[PDB]
Design a protein around this ligand. Structure first.
Ligand SMILES: [Cu+2]
Length: 98
């Protein structure tokens, strides 16, 4: 049972919601595209290893109100994701794989 995040409120404010998710080692997590596009979900190697952070990242440009991404949360650890454009605009989210 994957967690589901949305890249922006299903209204019109760019917030990652849920901004922090906790799910199990080996499960996956989905993201839903909404509004204020483009967004991407770009994981900084935020304590976790480069390769895992990379493979979990999505530099895919999400234009279609319908496109959704999935990441495999194998390695227990912290992954911290942001948007490339909105990186430092307060648009960030966090993952705790258990
Ligand atoms: Cu964004």
């Amino acid at each position: 049972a994957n967690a589901t995040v949305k890249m922006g409120s299903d209204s019109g404010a760019l917030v990652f919601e849920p901004s922090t998710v906790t799910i199990k080692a080996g499960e996956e997590v989905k993201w839903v595209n909404n509004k204020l596009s483009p967004h991407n979900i770009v994981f900084a190697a935020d304590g976790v290893d480069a390769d895992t952070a990379a493979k979990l990242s999505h530099k895919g440009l999400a234009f279609a109100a319908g496109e959704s991404f999935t990441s495999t949360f194998t390695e227990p650890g912290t992954y911290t994701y942001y948007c490339e454009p909105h990186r430092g605009a307060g648009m960030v989210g966090k993952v705790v794989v258990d």
